[PDB]
Design a protein around this ligand. Structure first.
Ligand SMILES: *[C@@H]1O[C@H](CO)[C@@H](O)[C@H](O)[C@H]1NC(C)=O
Ligand SMILES: *[C@@H]1O[C@H](CO)[C@@H](O)[C@H](O)[C@H]1NC(C)=O
Lengths: 99, 105
């Protein structure tokens, strides 16, 4: 067809080098961070990863912001539903608007 | 201020710079336990004030989060909130009352 911009950049001595970590390696790092966050809490960043149920970890998070932990255990399904609705809203905003 | 739970730091002078000696706290020897979010006693839900409920298989204890120091579950280290029909994962146990043996004697 026609000459590309990248070909004209290449023919004049301008070269683009690939990064050291591929996108699959970044995705592996991201998945490891997510799995350590979900299954351990903050314990995997200060030493060995210690398992804790996610409701009890979330009660620790509620205790950290000044709310007593019976508030989570007495409103667990509502908080789970609100989290799922907000994740779905992020899905809708990412599939709709690209700005 | 370093990797781990920070305790102290010490400066040292270096050419064109500074060196920090960060002193941290690192947990060492973990151990698996069975845990519950609340204790159902006399139709009341008990939650730990500070700490976590753990079980070695037969008896239940309350201990702090970063060090295994098991203690007997008592109304001093627990508080009451509602009944047992709401919490998911609540277990049945007794909670010790210090006033009854003092009143009996
Ligand atoms: C805890 O349990 C898991 C699986 O049951 C096991 O792999 C692990 O060695 C146990 N002990 C510790 C200290 O994590
Ligand atoms: C706890 O005790 C109540 C009555 O004391 C009983 O109805 C309930 O089934 C018990 N729960 C379990 C898990 O055994």
């Amino acid at each position: 067809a026609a000459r590309d911009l990248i070909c004209a950049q290449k023919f004049n001595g301008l070269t683009v080098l690939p990064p050291l970590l591929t996108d699959e390696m970044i995705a592996q790092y991201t998945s490891a961070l997510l799995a350590g966050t979900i299954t351990s809490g903050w314990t995997f960043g200060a030493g060995a990863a210690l398992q804790i149920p996610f409701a009890m970890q979330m009660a620790y998070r509620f205790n950290g912001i000044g709310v007593t932990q019976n508030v989570l255990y007495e409103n667990q399904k509502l908080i789970a539903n609100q989290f799922n609705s907000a994740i779905g809203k992020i899905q809708d905003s990412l599939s709709s608007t690209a700005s | 201020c370093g990797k781990g739970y920070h305790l102290m730091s010490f400066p040292q002078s270096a050419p064109h710079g500074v060196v920090f000696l960060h002193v941290t706290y690192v947990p060492a020897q973990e151990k698996n336990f069975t845990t519950a979010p609340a204790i159902c006693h006399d139709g009341k839900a008990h939650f730990p004030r500070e700490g976590v409920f753990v079980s070695n298989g037969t008896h239940w204890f309350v201990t702090q989060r970063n060090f295994y120091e098991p203690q007997i579950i008592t109304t001093d280290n627990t508080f009451v909130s509602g009944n047992c029909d709401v919490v998911i994962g609540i277990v049945n146990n007794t909670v010790y009352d210090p006033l009854q043996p003092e009143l009996d004697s």
